[PDB]
Amino acid sequence: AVQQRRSSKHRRDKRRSHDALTAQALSVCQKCGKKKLFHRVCSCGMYGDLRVKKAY
Amino acid sequence: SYINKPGKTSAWRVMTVRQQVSAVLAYGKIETTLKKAKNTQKRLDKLITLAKVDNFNNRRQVKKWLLNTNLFDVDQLMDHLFSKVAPKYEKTPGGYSRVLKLGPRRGDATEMAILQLTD
Amino acid sequence: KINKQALIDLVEQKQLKAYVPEFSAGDEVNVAIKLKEKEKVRIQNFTGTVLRRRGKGISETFIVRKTTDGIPIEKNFQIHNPNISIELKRRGKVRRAYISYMRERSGKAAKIKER
Amino acid sequence: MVSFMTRLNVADNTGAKQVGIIKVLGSTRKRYAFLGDVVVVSVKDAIPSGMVKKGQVLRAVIVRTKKGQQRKDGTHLKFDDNACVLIKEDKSPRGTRIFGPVARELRERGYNKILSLAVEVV
């Protein structure tokens, strides 16, 4: 249960190709003027109308 | 398993649950995992809904949920709670609280959720 | 869609002994046992104590013991079961709702008829 | 679900007490026995007042099973004990003093010598 050769860069990156990625959630923030990822708190301490969190 | 980690097990979880429910009593606010915040919240709602018969058996049982704190005790939290908190919540059909989605950890980049509730 | 599961009981309503004599899973009962080898319902009674008893409907079941010829007779029946006529005769007593001990215990140990 | 190298009583007086399967005859990998099944069995327990020596091998049918077996009707028939009785190559048993009333899910498979040799069948 071992490797025999080393590889060539292109096939490495091909394995890595459909090892692709995906992005963040996204919503808007106007209770404090940002754009948070969807279904979270915003940058400001608020998760919608009220500051559900402290300043920092 | 090589005499290393036992990790997470139901007794550890339930001990943490009892401790942090005692905590939120002391505070009314916890910054935990949702997977744990909501999980606690079911038993929390149970206790809330059941706390308001306000009897000595209620005392003897809610005894089974607390310890010594930096802030409160059994005798202090229990009493204050019984005195003032319950009826303002006696009229709604469950869902007493909110777990709300903060940002994730720094220590592990894991999604911290805040468990709280306001009258 | 609308899954109610009351329908279970709604259809069970057609084979249900309406009187369902109560007892304990340690209660001494008897039953008239229909005997139709190919003919002529007779009655062999298999008295004895109920051993276990679970109730949820037609899947109500229970066990009864006898001890004859140094031979223990342990037969499970369905509580709701046609050709089964039930009589509770003398009530036993145990504060545990599933036990096994008397299947292997000697005499002179009968519990009191429940006062 | 009764198979080889499982010893049980000799539930019929012939002069033996204990007996173990040596083979469950007939169907290959049937590998089980149930009430009404006849198999060949070696006796290791015998008295001189009977007619058998320990080590003989003959054919017996299991009448009782600590595991029990379900009635056709559904009354979940069971026993506390696994008993077997020896027959002489036919539904005539080799033992005759009936120790407890014998099973009833065998009658159709014959054995009615025994089912008659008892004031009741259980």
Add this chain to the structure above:
Amino acid sequence: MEIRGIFGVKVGMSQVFTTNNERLPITVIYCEPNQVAGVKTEAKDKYSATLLSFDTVENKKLNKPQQGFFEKNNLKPTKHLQEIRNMTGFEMGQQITPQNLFQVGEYVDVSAISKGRGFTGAIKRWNFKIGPLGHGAGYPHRFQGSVQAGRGGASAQRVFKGKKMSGHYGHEKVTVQNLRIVGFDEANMLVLVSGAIAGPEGGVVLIRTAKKKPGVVKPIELAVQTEKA
């Protein structure tokens, strides 16, 4: 053919006692009188088949293509739309009761996708034997044993295509056949069957007419509880 089919929901499993004083396997299945959606001749779309519309719902709770054609054919919007070949004699948009498709004691076959078991072992997928414990087997005490296919450039040195190997277990459409129909309640849109039936509660299960004993319609009365007072 005359393939009588029906869509139900696995809404109970119990036991019942019948004539000849014998226990009957009981599978409770919720089945409303459904409505075919489309019928095609062996010459219309080149095969004689019928798709049926079932689980009738509100209009705007489904794709607008699907609801659009529901109203294009002007039939009841049923979230489910499933076809079977061999039968087209069911007039366009025919809300139908199955007491006409099925009688109370005959045989049918019951297609129901089974328990989705997730990934499986072969000892339960292909249902093999577990290893022994003594004499040393180590951690590999539960393995495929010999799977050598070829040694040397003249045996095989490869692996069998199509080979039985574990994977996601259960959870594909399968049928249980020769199960007797037991009884109906169109008032409750419900039915009883015998058997031991693949699939969970809540799912819709298809039932065709039996492939072995459809010409076998045989009742033995359900014995009610005898003594009552």
Add this chain to the structure above:
RNA sequence: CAAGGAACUCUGCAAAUUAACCCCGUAAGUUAGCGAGAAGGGGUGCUUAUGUAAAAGUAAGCCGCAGUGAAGAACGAGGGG
């Protein structure tokens, strides 16, 4: 892990049965020190009263399905070499 019970094997390795106390008892051999926890068994909780300074222990009552109430304790027996 129900149900057996070693069928496994080259083979009971494993694995389990065993264990504490009080008390009973133990074969043959044997060279007479043993064997011998040989073999093989019973009681065991509490309330009372009694036991004495302490208790082994007694009797009565009580209670359980059951009381080294969980920790922790030898598993035999024979054969030959």
Add this chain to the structure above:
RNA sequence: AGCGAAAUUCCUAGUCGGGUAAAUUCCGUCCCGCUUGAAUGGUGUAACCAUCUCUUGACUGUCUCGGCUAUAGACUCGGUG
């Protein structure tokens, strides 16, 4: 002498018996023992054995026969790597 098919007997799956439903191993017997063989002593020896090894009581997931609960992973994240 002795013991003898043996920790050492080709024949040999010698013999007889036990053991064994049924036993190329075993125990006891019988001995033309290929070269057994009395100071590498013979031939036994009570005990005893992390000694061999036979039978055999409990005991058993060793087994049939397959499987359930809890976690350690493995699996996911994120890092380190």
Add this chain to the structure above:
RNA sequence: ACCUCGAUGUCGACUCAUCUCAUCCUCGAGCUGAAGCAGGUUCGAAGGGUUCGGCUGUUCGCCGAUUAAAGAGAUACGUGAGUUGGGUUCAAACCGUCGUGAGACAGGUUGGUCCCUAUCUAUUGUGCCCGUAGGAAGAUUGAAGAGUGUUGCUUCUAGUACGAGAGGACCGAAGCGAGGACACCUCUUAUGCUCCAGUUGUAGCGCCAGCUGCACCGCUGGGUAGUAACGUGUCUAUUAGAUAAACGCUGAAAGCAUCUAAGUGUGAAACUAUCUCAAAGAUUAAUCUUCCCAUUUCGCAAGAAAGUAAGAGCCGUCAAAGACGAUGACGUUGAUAGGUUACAGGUGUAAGCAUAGUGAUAUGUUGAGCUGAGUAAUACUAAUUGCUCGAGGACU
């Protein structure tokens, strides 16, 4: 001794096996020194099947037991990056031997340390990028496949035939199996680590009480949701087509006859279909139909701004799904999960209270309490108030 010694795991065991049929048995047939019965002989004939227990590393061997059989060969005496290691194969000790002796002994006596992290390929399951040629939506289809395609018994049939006498049919019917396999939990198990109960003492909880840890989760026993078989159901049919052997018919040669030559058939567990699944990336890209869709105006003509409305995605509430992917549900226009409720359900009368006993408890309060998961309702909380893509048929 070819060819690897700058290195080829080779015996047996177990497993997976599989494969050739010169087939044991299960299908048929043919012929008989084939009364029946039981045979023999010969073939078609691999669909499937063909056991266990003891003796020895050891299959082979023997045995004891049979059953439709316990078939024979083949794969590095297949099969250790599949497992042991029993032994012949470690040094180690000894015995019969031999050597003069150390030593050697297909002579024995006692045992003596199995590395792997998968690069690929194969192959399983399956996710995605793109295709399938306006977009979105379903429905298909079946190129090409896969399987299952085993059997015994009870009863009649019928002591009937046959034979003679015993004995004992041919054929078919029905059942019952075994096994063996897909499934299911009502049973029944076992599990059911946040259901419940007794529950020891020790450290806790100012004291009784009443509960906690800790000890397997202390022990013990139940037990819901569920899990899982040892549980139960189904399944083993039936059919057509092609037929093998085989039997034909007509009818030759060879005035005949001759199943062949032409003509016409019949005939096997084997074959094709009948059953199931799965399938059009089947680039073979197929098909049916559904919805949507055309907002002045640039380009070797597409849109320079209206970019779906058809839908899809992301986010989430999630579960039957689930390694994850993903499949599914739906997201406030919401019942998705939870909570709230009511019940189920089982643990099986709670605490506390008063009575009694001296108390170990009983008493009645009490089917009481309780209830991880069920059921079914309640917008009470969270399922976001969002963003992203997503229209103009270019061309036959």
